[PDB]
Amino acid sequence: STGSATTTPIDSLDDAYITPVQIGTPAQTLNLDFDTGSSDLWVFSSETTASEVDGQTIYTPSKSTTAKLLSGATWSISYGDGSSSSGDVYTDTVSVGGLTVTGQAVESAKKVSSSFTEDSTIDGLLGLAFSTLNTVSPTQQKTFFDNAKASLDSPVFTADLGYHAPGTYNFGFIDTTAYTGSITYTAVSTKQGFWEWTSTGYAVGSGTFKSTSIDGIADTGTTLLYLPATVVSAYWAQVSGAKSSSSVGGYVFPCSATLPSFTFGVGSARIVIPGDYIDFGPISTGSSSCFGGIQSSAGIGINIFGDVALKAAFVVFNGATTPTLGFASK
């Protein structure tokens, strides 16, 4: 089997992407944030505290003939941005782009933090990291991808995120028309439950490539590119007027400045992030200070190749017995 679904930016900055997902019988379609940095499929639901729901589409398990309470199961998750949610669990039929999993754990939110309530465009998350990070207790549950894997033509999914445009998540096959050149594969460590890999270095603009190992995670659920302070400083030093602002919470730059590209290494291959991808617009409406798309990972504890980086590539998440990551230009 295979599946193919279009993913669409939630706003003009590509802050996140939503992908339609069919849950239950008859289908209830919710727009979920596919997140390769976490491993829970959770939804706004008929059980979510009413004051915490503001415009989202909800899953109502009582209206699904295939929903079954996963008796005794609870879940509770906190994300790197300080957001959180928690609740109980149903199993139900879940389909993504024509690919169907029966008996998928659908984690129904009883509570969500303010960041989720305030984002009317995101109806939940669909985790695509390794199932060892799943928060369901007492019985940890498998991700959609893990459940689908055995039925897939090939045990892979791909992320092809657009810059200010829709893209595609495919399951079970690699679309050879979706990228240019070849796919370079690189080793993954699953020790922390993430798609964790080591970039071979970086370049700023037309500068010379610096060979240096940068361990990080491929995370579709993080907007920006978070790298060591040394790397980030080297980048912003090439932007006229750029500075790190403690009041704003990162590097900002005058909207009049031109941004250089940023290249990252995948083995001997190179992915070029165009300068425009690094512009996240005014810090506040009408401001001449623009927020940068490359920021320091210092104090996160891990480097994160988020959407800024991933959307510059066609990315293969290879879930074979020995998992790997592939990157191609496009």
The catalytically annotated residue of 14, 33, 35, 119 is 35
Q: Which residues contact 112 (CB under 8 A, 6 or more apart)?
A: 44, 48, 49, 52, 84, 85
Q: Give the DSSP per-residue string, 192-259.
A: TSS-EEEEEEEEETTSPPEEEEEEEEE-TT--SEEE-HHHHHHHHTTSTT-EEETTTTEEEEETTSPP
State how far the Cα of 311 lies from the Cα of 219, in Å rounded to an integer: 11
| Residue for token pair 């706003």 | 11
Beta-carbon neighbour count of residue 175 at 10 Å? 13
Please answer whether residues 37 and 223 qualify as being in contact, where contact means their C-beta atoms are separated by less than 8 angstroms. Answer: no
Q: Which of 38, 39, 199, 261 is catalytic?
A: 199
- The CA-CA-CA angle for residues 193, 196, 197, to 5°, reads 160
54 annotated active-site: no
Told to judge if 244 belongs to the known catalytic residues of this protein, a careful annotator would answer: no
Q: Residue 284: beta bridge partners?
A: none
- Which of helix, strand or coil describes residue 151? helix
Residue 307 is encoded by which pair of tokens?
A: 């959407």
Two tokens at 245? Answer: 């602002």
What is the DSSP code (8-state) at residue 62? Answer: G
Tokens linked to 286: 């009408």
Within 8 A by CB and 6+ apart from 24, the residues are 59, 61, 63, 64, 65, 66, 67, 92, 93
Q: Which residues contact 60 (CB under 8 A, 6 or more apart)?
A: 28, 45, 46
Would you call 185 helix, strand, or coil by DSSP? strand
Domains parsed from the chain with CATH numbers: 5-174 (2.40.70.10), 175-330 (2.40.70.10)
Q: Is the peptide bond before 138 cis (omega within 30 degrees of 0)?
A: yes
Pair of tokens at residue 90: 């149903």
